[PDB]
Amino acid sequence: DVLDEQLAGLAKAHPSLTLHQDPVYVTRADAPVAGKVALLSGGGSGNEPMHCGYIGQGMLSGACPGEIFTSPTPDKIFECAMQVDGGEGVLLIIKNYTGDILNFETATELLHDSGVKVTTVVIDDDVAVKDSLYTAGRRGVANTVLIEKLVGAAAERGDSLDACAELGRKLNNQGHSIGIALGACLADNEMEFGVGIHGEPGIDRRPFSSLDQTVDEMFDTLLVNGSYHRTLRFWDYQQGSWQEEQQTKQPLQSGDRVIALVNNLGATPLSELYGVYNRLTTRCQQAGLTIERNLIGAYCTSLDMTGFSITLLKVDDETLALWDAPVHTPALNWGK
Amino acid sequence: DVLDEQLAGLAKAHPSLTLHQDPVYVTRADAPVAGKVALLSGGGSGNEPMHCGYIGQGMLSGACPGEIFTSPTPDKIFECAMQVDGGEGVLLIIKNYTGDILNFETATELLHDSGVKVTTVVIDDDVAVKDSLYTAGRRGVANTVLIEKLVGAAAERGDSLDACAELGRKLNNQGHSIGIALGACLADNEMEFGVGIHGEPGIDRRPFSSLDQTVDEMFDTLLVNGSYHRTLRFWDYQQGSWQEEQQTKQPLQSGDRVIALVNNLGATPLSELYGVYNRLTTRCQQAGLTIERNLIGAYCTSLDMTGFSITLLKVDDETLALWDAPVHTPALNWGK
């Protein structure tokens, strides 16, 4: 019952959302919104507000929650996508986990065969660990939030499915995240360095000496692990098939302008996140990175894990315009 | 250093805020704003985003943070008030703790003597305990956030100092809060029932059985402890003296329309607060209470305490209009 009660609570708190039953998924109350590319995501419960907190104008059209840390079944994704399609296509944003990849792929193929124009964006921003417990390649973590906002803004503006997907894929190649935990959702004064959002092990356990030193090593790891080459699969709706694409991320470098996300993994005092941000700006300025915009708070949690993550996303004038554009969701709200 | 770093991070993250030094306090960057009543609050650190997260158009003009769970010294309050005064006077919002009461009282007096038109609003919404560790009467807790927004909206509209204060005092008499904790910032499956935001003891320690049963008894206590008679002290700037006023709160009753705040005390998973809200709505509906607006998240924390509080505030059409009015702060943002 607890998950059901939680979802009923969400629907009651937010009349602008619609909680569907049999199967369970969540959409904007006004879905389908005709005339715009629809954005859809989803994944396990326990990462709230990701993704149901991001449903609204300028962001997601709908989301499909699964069981705790467990991919939604493909029926939820298929039915949600059908519900949100506004005739300009549906963009599926998928975090890189083996379950999520499998279920979103099953749904995507069937959607295409049912006449829905669809394609995909995979998120693999976590720089810490290659081939973790539930992931081939790198894990999809808090950069998903930033990409959902930016691609959400483009869709809301009227950009085509192809333009939205291309933007999503580009941003994914330019975003870098790392997380640490001081306690699971460890010995005294010890941290799990490079932790995942489903409790997966990091690079190692190591001493926690101070907040400042912890940020320093997270920041250093973003730079050192920033270069990354891998194959990602995307749906080509013209051909009606999966296409593999080899792509390379460049590390962040001097001259880069970034959006910074300092994210609470569940149980970190907010005061401490401002201390994290303080050290982050100093390391950014020293490395010739300009932080243009920031988000600080609980945007991609891991239940009640004690820890935090840092995400830096390279941006330009055009992406900043997309950032500044209106968003109206439970977790992010600004503009007219 | 760590407090200093956290405040530096805040100032870096939000250029709409100005961090002052010698003494330390925080104001809107555009303060003093001419032609509008200025709103000021403050208190110990450890309750973030209260109060620095509420600085901005439609809410606080400034805030005076103290040391952890410790009132700001009166020099901070005096100097902050001087800075923010826009020639229409300053309203000081004070949570009912002996330290805060003492320090804001010292500052208010000196402000009046220095030519600043000033008055005060005391918050004593916590229904759990009378005469706690650091409180004469009832503790001031999360309803402070609600009053800050509503009075903030009244001041921004151009209401006089007296109207703003009268609104503040009235809302204080119609707002009711209670909190529980499952872990300090307890035995197995035991909760501290009626905990305070500085870790003060509650009504007692009692079993935790389920989230629904906990909400039931929190809600029942709001009703049972709702009636309250006490003396509150306010600054009469016409007489230039402290004036005692005896006032009585009525309990919420069938027919009342309310704003609901479900508040994370620091380490409760967000999903769980929606579960709390689900049950709260059911009990409200059963009791003839109409929840008109809600806030769910971390608005008045107690460092990394595991627990939550529920606040219900009686409202009417006029107050709902003030709720819906624009607000632009780090922690609360909506409207044009």
d(C-alpha A229, C-alpha A246), whole Å? 7
Nearest by Cα to B240 from B151, B99, B114, B87 = B114
DSSP for B27-39, written as a single string: EETT-S-TTS-EE
Question: Which residues in chain B precede a discontinuity of more than 2.5 Å between C and N?
Answer: 185
Which contacts qualify for A157-163: CB closer than 8 Å, 24 or more apart? A157/A322, A157/A325, A158/A35, A158/A36, A159/A37, A160/A37, A160/A88, A160/A89, A161/A37, A161/A88, A161/A89, A161/A90, A161/A91, A161/A117, A161/A118, A161/A119, A161/A237, A162/A119
3-state secondary structure of B151: helix
Coil/strand/helix, residue B85? coil
Q: Cα(B134)–Cα(B236) distance, rounded to whole angstroms?
A: 25
Name residue A235's beta-bridge partners. A242
Tokens of B211: 């989230």
Residue type, A233: R
Annotated catalytic residues of B are: 198
Beta strands B38-45; B175-183: pairing state: unpaired
Find out whether A31 and B253 touch, Cβ atoms under 8 Å. no
**Token duo for residue A160:** 């085509």
Find which of B2, B3, B5, B50 to mutate to test the A interface (most A CBs within 10 Å of its CB): B5
Alpha-carbon distance A38 to B319, whole Å? 37
The span from the CA of A21 to the CA of B129, in Å, is 43
| Amino acid identity at A133 | L
CATH number of A2-174: 3.40.50.10440
Residue of A14, A51, A176, A198 marked catalytic: A198
Question: What's the longest Cα–Cα distance across chain A?
Answer: 56
- Interface probe, candidates A69, A270, A328, chain B, greatest B C-beta count within 10 A: A270
**Contact between A302 and A47 (Cβ < 8 Å):** yes
Which candidate, B61, B49, B57, places its Cα nearest to that of B25? B61
Could you state, in order of their start, the residue ranges of all structural domains in chain A? 2-174, 175-336
Buried-exposed string A302-332: b where 16+ CB fall within 10 A, e elsewhere: bbbbbbbbbbbbbbeeebeebbebebbbbbb
Tell me which residue in A7, A277, A306 faces B12 most closely, judged by beta carbons: A277
CA of A111: how far to CAs of A90, A97, A234, in Å? 9, 21, 14
User: Among partner residues B2, B272, B333, which is closest to A275 by beta-carbon distance?
Assistant: B2
For residue B292, the chain A residue with the least C-alpha distance is A13
Q: Are B180 and B193 in contact (CB under 8 A)?
A: yes
CA angle, A110 then A114 then A118, to 5°: 70
Beta bridge pairs of residue A121: A93
Long-range contacts of B185-193 (CB under 8 A, 24+ apart): B185/B46, B185/B266, B185/B302, B185/B303, B185/B304, B185/B305, B191/B307, B192/B307, B193/B128, B193/B217
Instruction: Tell me which chain B residue has its CA closest to the CA of residue A270.
Output: B48
User: How far apart are alpha carbons A305 and B263 in whole angstroms?
Assistant: 18
**Distance between CA atoms of B77 and B116, rounded to whole angstroms?**
13
| Residue A317 to residue A158: CA distance in whole angstroms | 18
Question: What would the 3-class secondary structure string for chain A be?
Answer: CHHHHHHHHHHHHCCCEEEECCCCEEEECCCCCCCCCEEEEEEEECCCCCCHHHECECCECEEEEEEECCCCCHHHHHHHHHHHCCCCCEEEEEECCHHHHHHHHHHHHHHHHCCCCEEEEEECCECCCCCCCCCCCCCCCCHHHHHHHHHHHHHHHCCCHHHHHHHHHHHHCCEEEEEEEEECCCCCCEEEECCCCCCCCCCEEEECCCHHHHHHHHHHHHHHCCCEEEEEEEEECCCCEEEEEEEEECCCCCCCEEEEEEEECECCCHHHHHHHHHHHHHHHHHCCCEEEEEEEECCCCCCCEEEEEEEEEEECHHHHHHHHCCEECCCCEECC
Technique behind this structure? X-ray
CA angle A18, A23, A24 (to 5 degrees): 45
Query: Which of A65, A62, A51, A101 shows the shortest CA–CA distance to A85?
Result: A62
Which residue in the set B13, B267, B301 is minimally distant from A296, CB to CB? B13
Q: Where are the alpha helices (DSSP H) in chain B?
A: 2-13, 74-84, 98-113, 143-157, 161-172, 211-224, 270-286, 317-324
Instruction: Name, in order, each residue with C-beta under 8 angstroms of A209's C-beta and a sequence gap of 6 or more.
Output: A189
The answer to whether the beta carbons of residues B28 and B51 sit under 8 Å apart is no
Would you call A45 and B271 a contact, using CB atoms and an 8 Å cutoff? yes
The 10 Å Cβ neighbour count of residue B255 is 9
Question: Same CATH topology for A2-174 and A175-336?
Answer: no
User: Of B189, B223, B222, B251, nearest to B309 (Cα)?
Assistant: B222
Which member of B2, B53, B278 has the closest CB to residue A9?
B278
Interface of chain A against chain B, CB under 8 Å? Answer: 2, 5-10, 12-13, 45-46, 48-49, 53, 211-212, 266-279, 281, 294, 296-298, 301, 303-304, 306, 333-334, 336
Tokens (6 digits) for A133: 């417990």
* Cα distance between residue B302 and residue B266, in whole Å: 6
Joined together, the tokens standing for residue B334 give 């909506």
- Residue B163, exposed/middle/buried by CB under 10 A (0-12, 13-18, 19+)? middle
Q: How far is B241 from chain A (nearest CA, A)?
A: 37
Amino acid at B321: A
Q: A175-336 has which fold?
A: Hypothetical Protein Tm841; Chain: A;domain 3 (3.30.1180)
Four-CA torsion A51, A57, A61, A63, nearest 10 degrees: 10
